[PDB]
Amino acid sequence: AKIVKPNGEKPDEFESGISQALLELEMNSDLKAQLRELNITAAKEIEVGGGRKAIIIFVPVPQLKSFQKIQVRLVRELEKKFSGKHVVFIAQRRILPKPTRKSKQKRPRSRTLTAVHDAILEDLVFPSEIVGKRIRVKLDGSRLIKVHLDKAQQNNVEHKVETFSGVYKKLTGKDVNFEFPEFQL
Amino acid sequence: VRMNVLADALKSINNAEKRGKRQVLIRPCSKVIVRFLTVMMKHGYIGEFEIIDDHRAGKIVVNLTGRLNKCGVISPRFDVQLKDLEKWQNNLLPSRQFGFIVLTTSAGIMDHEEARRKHTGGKILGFFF
Amino acid sequence: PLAKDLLHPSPEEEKRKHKKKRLVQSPNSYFMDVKCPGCYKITTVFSHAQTVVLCVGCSTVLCQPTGGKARLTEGCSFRRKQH
Amino acid sequence: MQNDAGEFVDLYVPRKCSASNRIIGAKDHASIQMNVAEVDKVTGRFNGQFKTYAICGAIRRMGESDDSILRLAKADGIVSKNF
Amino acid sequence: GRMHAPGKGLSQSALPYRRSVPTWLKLTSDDVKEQIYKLAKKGLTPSQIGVILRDSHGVAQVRFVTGNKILRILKSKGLAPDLPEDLYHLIKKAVAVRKHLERNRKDKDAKFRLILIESRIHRLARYYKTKRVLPPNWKYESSTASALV
RNA sequence: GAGUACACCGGAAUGAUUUGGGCGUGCCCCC
RNA sequence: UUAAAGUUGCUGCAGUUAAAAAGCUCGUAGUUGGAUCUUGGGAGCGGCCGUCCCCUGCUCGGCGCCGGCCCGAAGCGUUUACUUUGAAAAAA
């Protein structure tokens, strides 16, 4: 009902249940004036390493500034409607391949792989923003991104960093660690 | 003005290695500098290098160790072939036991030994021993 | 110090150095919100304002342009804000 | 130092500095080899073992060897970590 | 350092790493656009527009709250001037130096600085011819200079 | 409704009732 | 005449005092030019790693099965240098 798929095909069951829960929310709360056209692209669940799981929710790119104003209430509502599950909102952005000479409009740089990954990283952590990135190369040659988070508003996201690393490994495929340093504030 | 960032990076590494320092700060970053340091660090001449990410141009801080003798560049990028590599490692390297020439290759940034047993060559970057 | 750590220095050295020569450069300025004691409005101004500004309602002048920081007039309180 | 048979052939393995990992030559008289005594855990006496640090002559000629010795003693566990 | 001076100075802005609209900024992008439109209709260069916005409106940068530059906004509206502002300022300085120089024939430092100013004008003019902002038939000329504001 | 302290309220919390303000979201006015 | 000559210096010279930075500056041709656009895995072998296959589109038609599927192909694909292979390149 509320969920819009970009392709004309059958939606799955988990995203259908999430859409039913959020439409029952906007019918049975004070958000029906602010969730009229606000649709959901898709949803997916993963297996976070440990003893829990998480839900990834896809959102169309004009609908980010609207959901960022009501991000705080929706995560609380999906927490109280589920059992013990943390939920994150991630935009769906398209990645175009590199225009090699073996293969037409010029590819915009917002659709490049690094720009998509940086946008996914900054949109995953909404209540705490990026105040510094560090990249460490271990002895086997692989990278290790270390992300610094701001000191203000840390009482909600001090325990969600493991789910953040899990979803960043699942969607992108790069190692990431989250820290709260003491330099500026 | 600034014309070659890899040259200044290797000169800074050489100067701080001669001074006995333990860490450096390369001011501009690039892909070729990261690949060149990756070749050194895979071959066991330096430690882990951290890339300080910002929105203009990154800075690289490598954990230096007492394991390096010299790092240098060959400007401009002279193209070499398989028949021209022997002269370069003859007049550029101390011995035929160690030391490497890193050269730009269509297979990637890679040293002269795998350039030899991959049967491919290209433009030269520099040397270290 | 031949083994000085450049990755994680103390914040006193970061505040000590130039605004361009840190690990990540940060400006030395800030945004402030000076208010008049005779008026009831609040106006947000820049620290290194380098212009003359008027209050909302055309009553007083808030700051005066100098070489560096703006010279706020006397009696008017202000506080630093952040985000 | 080795060959195809793998046997050792060098005259002697030279000592390396413990601060800069540089080769200490046979004619570098400014190089030292410091011995540091440990202590008993409870009674607090000389148990008998040795802790050895070697500093090349270039570091002492620079005059920045006490920082290196203090760093090596902090790494070994002699000097307290807070210091 | 400089292109026409032996000094090697270091004094410019230092943009912050943080990329977000501040939470205390209660100005919609359409609102700061409207302030930009009315202040550009007041007859100002984009430099003074950016100064006035950051000085009396609290916005850090326009392109961080609108996603678009000031001159691109004025070009999309259709009220950006044909002759750009830096070349206009250089031409104004050149004609002021020439107006000073025509009366004082003994002033040689004015002649040397005029030579430097026309050198900078020619370099900026050939770059603007390269990026097709100026037509290729445009040329700097003395008698044309007083005809140009 | 100029609002520094303000005067009427609508939502809303437990059939019935109701909790000093401002916009500088955190310290400023009155006790 | 060649090496010796690192006394013609591309490899590879010198310019404070020994031979040698134009008095200074602007400037066209020439030379040299900042960062950034696709990362990471699966199938297996020896014990994560040195080899193994993969991440450019449509009209004629052949390793085959019962109008439905794979393969081939008359036709074209953003251009340079660099790099590797192949042809041809008289003898002494």
Coordinates of C-alpha atoms in Angstrom, one line a residue, chain D:
Chain D
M1 CA 75.3 -14.3 5.6
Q2 CA 74.0 -17.5 4.0
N3 CA 74.4 -19.3 0.6
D4 CA 72.7 -22.0 -1.4
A5 CA 73.7 -24.6 1.2
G6 CA 72.3 -22.2 3.9
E7 CA 75.4 -22.3 6.1
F8 CA 76.6 -19.2 7.9
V9 CA 79.6 -17.4 6.4
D10 CA 79.8 -13.9 8.0
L11 CA 82.5 -13.0 10.4
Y12 CA 80.2 -11.6 13.1
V13 CA 76.7 -10.3 13.4
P14 CA 76.9 -6.6 14.3
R15 CA 74.9 -5.1 17.1
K16 CA 72.0 -2.9 16.1
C17 CA 70.9 0.2 18.0
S18 CA 67.8 -0.2 20.2
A19 CA 66.5 3.3 19.4
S20 CA 67.0 3.9 15.7
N21 CA 67.7 0.3 14.5
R22 CA 70.9 1.4 12.9
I23 CA 74.1 -0.7 12.7
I24 CA 76.6 0.0 15.4
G25 CA 80.0 -0.1 13.7
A26 CA 83.2 -1.6 15.0
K27 CA 84.9 1.8 15.2
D28 CA 82.0 3.8 16.7
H29 CA 83.4 4.5 20.2
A30 CA 80.5 6.9 21.1
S31 CA 78.1 3.9 21.1
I32 CA 77.2 2.5 24.5
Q33 CA 75.5 -0.6 25.9
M34 CA 73.5 0.3 29.0
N35 CA 72.5 -2.3 31.6
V36 CA 69.4 -1.7 33.7
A37 CA 68.7 -3.8 36.8
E38 CA 65.2 -5.1 37.7
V39 CA 63.8 -5.4 41.2
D40 CA 62.0 -8.0 43.3
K41 CA 58.2 -7.8 43.2
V42 CA 57.6 -7.7 47.0
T43 CA 60.9 -7.4 48.9
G44 CA 62.4 -4.9 46.4
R45 CA 66.0 -6.1 45.9
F46 CA 68.3 -7.0 43.0
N47 CA 67.2 -10.5 41.8
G48 CA 70.1 -11.0 39.4
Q49 CA 68.8 -10.6 35.9
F50 CA 69.9 -7.9 33.3
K51 CA 68.0 -5.6 31.0
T52 CA 70.2 -4.3 28.1
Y53 CA 69.8 -1.3 25.8
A54 CA 72.2 -0.2 23.1
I55 CA 72.4 3.4 21.8
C56 CA 74.4 4.3 18.8
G57 CA 76.8 7.2 18.7
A58 CA 74.7 9.3 16.4
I59 CA 71.9 9.5 19.0
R60 CA 74.3 10.5 21.8
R61 CA 76.0 13.0 19.5
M62 CA 72.5 14.4 18.8
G63 CA 72.0 14.4 22.5
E64 CA 68.5 12.8 22.5
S65 CA 69.3 9.5 24.1
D66 CA 67.6 9.9 27.5
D67 CA 64.2 10.1 25.8
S68 CA 65.0 6.9 23.9
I69 CA 66.1 5.1 27.0
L70 CA 63.0 6.3 28.9
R71 CA 60.8 5.1 26.0
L72 CA 62.4 1.7 26.0
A73 CA 62.1 1.5 29.8
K74 CA 58.4 2.4 29.5
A75 CA 58.0 -0.2 26.8
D76 CA 59.7 -2.9 28.9
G77 CA 57.7 -2.0 32.0
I78 CA 60.4 -0.5 34.3
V79 CA 59.0 3.1 34.4
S80 CA 55.4 3.5 35.6
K81 CA 53.0 4.1 32.8
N82 CA 51.6 7.4 34.1
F83 CA 55.1 8.8 34.8

